[PDB]
């Protein structure tokens, strides 16, 4: 019933553009929207985010997260490891590569979402959420070697899965970080289950 009529470029940077979108609302009335897009998509999606489940025997299962300064936020954020998919890279391969670069862990793929939207009232940005387990008892994950790209500066923060939400609430209360909404949503559902 609703559809895009046209898109007008307002402004194009190196990494992001702003567009004025015209669309038909369901009454037959024409309306506008200000829409953000990345200039880098080719791709099933812009990016991947990895849910990295660190499994060590005789330990709690952990979810591996990263902390980084985020210039759009003006501060540090706690997030799922993540990055843009390289042109002709598959979501799964992007997931293992990013996880290794950002955390030093080598993981196996468990499941892969379809493309999901990041903020659909604002942008067209999408990711694949890739659940990965990490056999923390293997020698390749003993002393994980993080291989950051240029200008990437990442701290690795592993938190127990069964208390994730309480552990994140504490980090916010004590360390003035912003937690990512997807991380928070995952933590909430771990508590809300059953």
Ligand X SMILES: Cc1nsc(N2CCCNCC2)n1
Question: Which residue in 15, 74, 143, 173 binds ligand X (CB under 6 A)?
Answer: 15
Tokens of 33: 């929207």
- Indicate the DSSP class of residue 125: -
Interface with Mg ion, residue 104, by CB under 5 A: no
Residues 172 and 179: their CA atoms lie apart, in Å, by 7
Question: Which residue in 50, 51, 82, 168 binds Mg ion (CB under 5 A)?
Answer: 82
Tell me how far apart the 2 most distant CA atoms of the chain are, in Å: 62
**Residue 194 buriedness (CB in 10 A; 0-12 / 13-18 / 19+):** exposed
Q: Report the site for its own copies in 60-119 (rule: CB under 8 A).
A: 69-74, 76-77, 79, 82, 113-119
What is the phi/psi pair of residue 108, to 5°? -115, 145
Interface with its own copies, residue 25, by CB under 8 A: yes
**How far is Cα of residue 59 from the mean position of the Cα atoms in its chain?**
26
Residues 179 and 157: their CA atoms lie apart, in Å, by 12
Give the x/- contact pattern for its own copies in 110-149, rule: CB under 8 A: ---xxxxxxxxxxxxxxx-x-x------------------
Question: Which option in its own copies, Cl ion, ligand X, none does residue 116 bind, with CB closer than 5 to 8 A by kind?
Answer: its own copies
**CB of 13 or CB of 28, closer to ligand X:** 13
The span of 7-15, 89-97, 98-106, 136-144 binding its own copies (CB under 8 A) equals 7-15
The span of 2-10, 61-69, 81-89, 184-192 binding Cl ion (CB under 5 A) equals 184-192
């Amino acid at each position: 019933k609703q559809y895009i009529i046209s898109e007008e470029l307002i402004s194009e940077g190196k990494w992001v553009k702003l567009e004025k979108t015209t669309y038909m609302d369901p009454t037959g009335k024409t309306r506008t929207w200000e829409s953000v897009k990345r200039t880098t998509r080719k791709q099933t999606a812009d990016g991947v985010a990895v849910i990295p489940v660190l499994q060590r025997t005789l330990h709690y299962e952990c979810i591996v997260l990263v902390k980084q300064f985020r210039p759009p936020m003006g501060g540090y954020c706690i997030e799922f490891p993540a990055g843009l998919i390289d042109d002709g890279e598959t979501p799964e391969a992007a997931a293992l590569r990013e996880l290794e670069e950002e955390t030093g862990y080598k993981g196996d793929i468990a499941e892969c979402s379809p493309a999901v939207c990041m903020d659909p009232g604002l942008s067209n940005c999408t990711i694949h959420i890739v659940t990965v387990t990490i056999n923390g008892d293997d020698a390749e994950n003993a002393r994980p070697k993080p291989k950051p790209g240029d200008g990437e500066f990442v701290e690795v923060i592993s938190l127990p899965k069964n208390d994730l939400l309480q552990r994140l609430d504490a980090l916010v209360a004590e360390e003035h970080l912003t937690v990512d909404a997807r991380v928070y949503s995952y933590a909430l559902a771990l508590k809300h289950a059953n």
